[PDB]
Amino acid sequence: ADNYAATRYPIILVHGLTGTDKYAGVLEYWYGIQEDLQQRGATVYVANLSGFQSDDGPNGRGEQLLAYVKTVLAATGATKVNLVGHSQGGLTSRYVAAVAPDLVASVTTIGTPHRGSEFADFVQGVLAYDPTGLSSTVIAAFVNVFGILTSSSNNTNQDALAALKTLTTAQAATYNQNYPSAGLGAPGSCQTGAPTETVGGNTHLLYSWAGTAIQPTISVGGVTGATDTSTIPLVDPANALDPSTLALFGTGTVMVNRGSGQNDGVVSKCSALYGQVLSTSYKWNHLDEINQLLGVRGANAEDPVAVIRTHANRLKLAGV
Ligand SMILES: [Ca+2]
């Protein structure tokens, strides 16, 4: 143990869609990461928000995170926090930085769909093929109950249809108009913005990274095939011992056939860009970014625990 990850301001890790701090009170979303950071001197809290909600709205994840931030500040005596969000958690973190800029020192997003997900567009589109609409009602009930059962606090505020809509590309574009950020490039640019923002006189350091394990590698008769560069081809034991590996290869194949380009299975490189883009070259699928499932990753994947730990040191050296 040492103080490699000791930051001036407490770190809050912010989960995305489906999440909670601990699924069924047992499986950490951020697998082994709070422990690692704490062993290296960090003060780190893990938010527990609705797994299925919008980020805006009175009952949304953003207001939930804002309330949680205030409790962390009261507990630590600190005056600001460093927000580190995965997937939708990066959108939630942007919300808090925008509405309570005095309480935030930095925003880091990991695999965050700032421009939405072509996979959400796909799923929304699928539901439109039920002319009765009953598929939407039934599957929403199913997913909402999954959220209640797996939430560590059995949080009943779950709205799967709102969560799905939130993550579509059209809706994300609206979100970015409603919650603009100096850290974002222009819509349609596949570019980032500035590395910092100053909002109401409060400076925030802005960072991101992306996983791009899923690479488009062949085009034949209009159909695009992908390669999972995180793995030794086919035989990698991560394909056997982590069911998300092949699942995210499959969803990532749907993504590339909707024009996403390289992606992590559910978020494209372009969608993930925000602030100072530290890397988009990690050979990671979306769950590898949070050391999931249960620490299993392909042989070519970088160590995500070490990446996050090094980023805590980066924050420390930057003065937050
Ligand atoms: Ca994995």
Distance 102 CA to ligand 1 centre (A): 36
List % helix, strand, coil for the chain (3-state, nearest 5).
40, 20, 40
Instruction: Quote the tokens at residue 6.
Output: 């000791």
Residue entry with tokens 């409790």 = 71
Q: Where residue 218 sits, what CATH number does that domain have?
A: 3.40.50.1820
- Residues that place a CB less than 5 A from ion ligand 1: 242, 287-288, 296-297
Annotate 3-16 with DSSP letters as a single string.
Answer: STT--SS-EEEE--
Which residue range(s) make up the domain with 230? Answer: 1-320
In angstroms, the CA 25 to CA 265 distance is 26
In angstroms, the CA 72 to CA 149 distance is 25
Distance 110 CA to ligand 1 centre (A): 15
- Residues recorded for the chain: 320
The answer to whether the beta carbons of residues 253 and 214 sit under 8 Å apart is: yes
DSSP state of 131: T
Distance 289 CA to ligand 1 centre (A): 8
Distance 246 CA to ligand 1 centre (A): 9
What b-and-e string marks burial along 65-100, b requiring 16 or more CB atoms within 10 Å of the CB? bbebbeebbeeeebebbbbbbbbbbbbbbbbbbbbb
Instruction: Quote the tokens at residue 211.
Output: 């996983």
**83 CB contacts (<8 Å, ≥6 apart)?**
12, 14, 65, 69, 93, 96, 97, 104, 106, 107, 108
DSSP state of 289: G
Distance 282 CA to ligand 1 centre (A): 13
Instruction: Quote the tokens at residue 189.
Output: 């640019």
Annotated binding-site residues for Ca(2+) read 242, 288, 292, 296
Phi/psi at 7 (nearest 5 deg)? -115, 160
The answer to whether the beta carbons of residues 67 and 45 sit under 8 Å apart is: no
In angstroms, the CA 281 to CA 125 distance is 30
10 Å Cβ neighbour count for 278? 17
Q: Which residues lie across from 218 on neighbouring strands?
A: 225
10 Å Cβ neighbour count for 307? 17
In angstroms, the CA 182 to CA 105 distance is 15
In angstroms, the CA 273 to CA 91 distance is 12
In angstroms, the CA 66 to CA 232 distance is 42
Instruction: Quote the tokens at residue 13.
Output: 């890790």
Cite the beta strand spans of 239-293 per DSSP E: 276-282
In angstroms, the CA 215 to CA 255 distance is 10
Q: Which residues lie across from 199 on neighbouring strands?
A: 202
User: For the packed helices 88-99 and 61-76, what is the interaxial angle rounded to 10 degrees?
Assistant: 70
In angstroms, the CA 37 to CA 312 distance is 8
* Helices and strands (DSSP H and E) totals, the chain: 11, 11
**After which residues do gaps appear in the chain, with C to N over 2.5 Å?**
none
Distance 201 CA to ligand 1 centre (A): 40
* Planar angle of CA 40, 29, 53, nearest 5 degrees: 130
- For residue 162, CA distances in Å to 57, 144, 194, 281 come to 11, 11, 30, 31
Cite the beta strand spans of the chain per DSSP E: 11-14, 22-23, 27-28, 44-46, 81-86, 104-110, 196-199, 202-211, 214-220, 223-228, 276-282
Instruction: Quote the tokens at residue 66.
Output: 């804002």
Cα atoms found within 13 Å of the Cα of residue 100, Cβ hemisphere only: 21
Phi/psi at 279 (nearest 5 deg)? -165, 145
Q: Which residues are catalytic?
A: 87, 264, 286
Q: For the chain, what is the domain count?
A: 1
Annotated binding-site residues read 17, 88, 242, 288, 292, 296
* CA 318 from centre of chain: 23
User: Obtained via which technique?
Assistant: X-ray
In angstroms, the CA 114 to CA 129 distance is 27
DSSP state of 51: S
Instruction: Quote the tokens at residue 282.
Output: 């990690």
Instruction: Quote the tokens at residue 153.
Output: 């606090």
Nearest CA-CA partner of 105 in 41, 170, 198, 19: 198
Note the resolution in Å, 1 decimal. 1.1
In angstroms, the CA 257 to CA 21 distance is 33
